[PDB]
Amino acid sequence: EFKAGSAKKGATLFKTRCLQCHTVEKGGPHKVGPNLHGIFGRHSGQAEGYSYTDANIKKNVLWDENNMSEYLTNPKKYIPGTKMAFGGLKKEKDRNDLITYLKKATE
Ligand code: HEC
Ligand SMILES: [Zn+2]
Ligand SMILES: [Zn+2]
């Protein structure tokens, strides 16, 4: 299950693995992937002005720390048909660290 990790390690993981396709700040632009502001507590496939796949919308997951960890373990396994071209974060340490950071960065 999800447990709070290191947000500093999380921020680096975000910069090096996620930032190329995602912004986190309020009003931040959409890039290859949607801006993630307010992602926790919002259903999947609902960021304003972003064109998602039917699969992402269909999943209809209410994003929380635990399901985000499961999704980030392997995105294509959790949401079959996703256009998010990312293999996943295989270490639970990395997922805990990234999510601790993301919970704050996207608030
Ligand atoms: C580009 C090559 C991407 C990288 C690198 C990462 N993400 Fe991604 N993500 C991307 C796209 C194109 C999409 C839309 C997928 C679709 O099928 O429509 C996404 C989506 C997400 C989501 C869900 C958004 C939502 O439901 O509103 C999340 C939570 C997400 N991406 C997180 C995320 C993180 C934390 C990553 C780094 C570890 C990451 N993404 C990398 C494209 C790309
Ligand atoms: Zn719901
Ligand atoms: Zn906010």
Swiss-Prot record:
Cystine connections: none
Principal subcellular localisation of the protein: mitochondrion
Keyword Repeat tagged: no
N6,N6,N6-trimethyllysine found at: K76, K77
Gene3D superfamilies for this protein: Cytochrome c-like domain
Family per similarity comment: Belongs to the cytochrome c family.
Name used for this protein in its record: Cytochrome c isoform 1
The encoding gene: CYC1
